[PDB]
Design a binder for these strands. Sequence first.
RNA 1: GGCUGUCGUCAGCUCGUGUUGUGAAAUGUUGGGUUAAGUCCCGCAACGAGCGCAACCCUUAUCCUUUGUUGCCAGCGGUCC
Length: 224
Amino acid sequence: VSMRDMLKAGVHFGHQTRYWNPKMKPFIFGARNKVHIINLEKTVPMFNEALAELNKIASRKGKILFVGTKRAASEAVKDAALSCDQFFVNHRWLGGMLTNWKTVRQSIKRLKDLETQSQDGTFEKLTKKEALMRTRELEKLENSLGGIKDMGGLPDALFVIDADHEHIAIKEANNLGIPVFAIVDTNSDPDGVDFVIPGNDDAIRAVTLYLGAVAATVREGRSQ
RNA sequence: GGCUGUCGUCAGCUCGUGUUGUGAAAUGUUGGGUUAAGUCCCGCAACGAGCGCAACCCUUAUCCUUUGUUGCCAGCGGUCC
Ligand SMILES: [Mg+2]
Ligand SMILES: [Mg+2]
Ligand SMILES: [Mg+2]
Ligand SMILES: [Mg+2]
Ligand SMILES: [Mg+2]
Ligand SMILES: [Mg+2]
């Protein structure tokens, strides 16, 4: 991935100096106007070393789960995983989506059966008042569980945009040994993720970049 | 044992799995709104479920169909009215 490209995106940008996390000292060039700057020279080799790892999982038809619920990087997230044939989460992660599979699995069945009882027309020939609680009931399920609806079991790797914001998923993923690939940032803990990609996690330009790239490689890897 | 009063027809009382705590425990069941109501909605390390709440039951208020004696008399005709 082009080291010039990122100057363009804004990846070098971090967070205000005061909100920094001192575990990210390694991945810092310095500060300008009391605002931190990611040493991109550390980003790019780290990043390419996570693309590679992602390839060889995507090789064996494992499932890259993508998570990103920021009211920036949601439509960004959906686009990418769909542009790959994988799974995604872009509205609140709901605690135990991984550790409590048994149960959360048993709320997918419902969403399946509410999809049927919609196209099949049952959500029409009924109480009319009961096309409220038989639709809102679906609408929400397909806002939350939708992304992972046909996922049948636990992922083979989470790919996570913001570590800070999505700390619950990462802990759950550590809980299950599921390897994690995060876009950590100057203000975030390095310490829970396995393939740390430094750089900005809060920009429409920056996110699409890493997504596009991880999208490219899982498709370039889902072939051989 | 069975049956019954009572707080109280008050809106509460809990469980599975997950998570937190060395542990009793906690979370859910808190928060913003709303409601007669843990009523409903939005949020949220919770995700769900159950007993309650409400609804299904009887009665009362209006209308329609069918049936018309031992009940009824609007229009007719008669009358010991
Ligand atoms: Mg423990
Ligand atoms: Mg209580
Ligand atoms: Mg409690
Ligand atoms: Mg409490
Ligand atoms: Mg409340
Ligand atoms: Mg209830």
